[PDB]
């Protein structure tokens, strides 16, 4: 499956794509304002994620650092990135169907639209200004808006026991972006698409 990843932000981002234990495609690449990068993801990819990283420096070998979303200092990500990171999440060809969603469970750094480019389902979007409205205690000094698990490390915020409920913090995410996961047990906003759909992930989809 192809995912066109498009940076409509006014700033450079370094796109990243991983399924946690491996890169997807090259795993990462710089996208200046306006650029598009098309990757190929193997059918049957389960638990895939795509995200943006900000204010990165890499050297000639592709080692460095990112202020949000750093995946162990690599340009070419093999593992998930350091919160805060708005996440495009997907599992492909799962008993005949694709599943897509956007999640704020690991915080928010960059607005995002995640849409099929092929027929038969809708896209999802989290494009509100969550960084500028972020509650004081969630603001990440390095840039972006942390989820409350990252900040406070409690069973309630992290949903460790499997029994958590919504919180003042999760409700800020949900109010700003009703169509993204705000906490682990949030009512699902996952979209069911035809198996083997193709997709576009757009950073900063709106002015």
From Swiss-Prot:
SMART domains: THN (SM00205). CDD domains: TLP-P. Gene3D superfamilies: Thaumatin (2.60.110.10). It comes from the Eukaryota. Its main location: cytoplasm. It is found in: Cytoplasmic vesicle. The keyword DNA-binding does not apply. Keywords: Cytoplasmic vesicle, Disulfide bond, Signal, Taste-modifying protein. Disulfide bonds join 9-204, 56-66, 71-77, 121-193, 126-177, 134-145, 149-158, 159-164. Pfam families: Thaumatin. InterPro entries: Osmotin/thaumatin-like_sf, Thaumatin, Thaumatin_CS. One of its GO terms (cellular component) is cytoplasmic vesicle. Coiled coil: none annotated. Taste-modifying protein; intensely sweet-tasting. It is 100000 times sweeter than sucrose on a molar basis. Belongs to the thaumatin family. This is Thaumatin I.
């Amino acid at each position: 499956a192809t995912f066109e990843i498009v940076n409509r932000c006014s700033y450079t981002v370094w796109a990243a794509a991983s399924k946690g234990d491996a890169a997807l495609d090259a795993g990462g690449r710089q996208l200046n304002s306006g650029e598009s990068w098309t990757i190929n993801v193997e059918p049957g990819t389960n638990g895939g994620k795509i995200w943006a990283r900000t204010d990165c420096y890499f050297d000639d070998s592709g080692s460095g650092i990112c202020k949000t979303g750093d995946c162990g200092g690599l340009l070419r990500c093999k593992r998930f990135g350091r919160p805060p990171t708005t996440l495009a999440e997907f599992s492909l060809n799962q008993y005949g169907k694709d599943y897509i969603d956007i999640s704020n469970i690991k915080g928010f750094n960059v607005p995002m639209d995640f849409s099929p480019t092929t027929r038969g389902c809708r896209g999802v979007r989290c494009a509100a200004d969550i960084v500028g409205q972020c509650p004081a205690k969630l603001k990440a000094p390095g840039g972006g808006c942390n989820d409350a698990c990252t900040v406070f490390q409690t069973s309630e915020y992290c949903c460790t026991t499997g029994k958590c409920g919504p919180t003042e913090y999760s409700r800020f995410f949900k109010r700003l972006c009703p169509d993204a996961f705000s906490y682990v047990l949030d009512k699902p906003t996952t979209v069911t698409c035809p198996g083997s759909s193709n997709y576009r992930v757009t950073f900063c989809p709106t002015a």
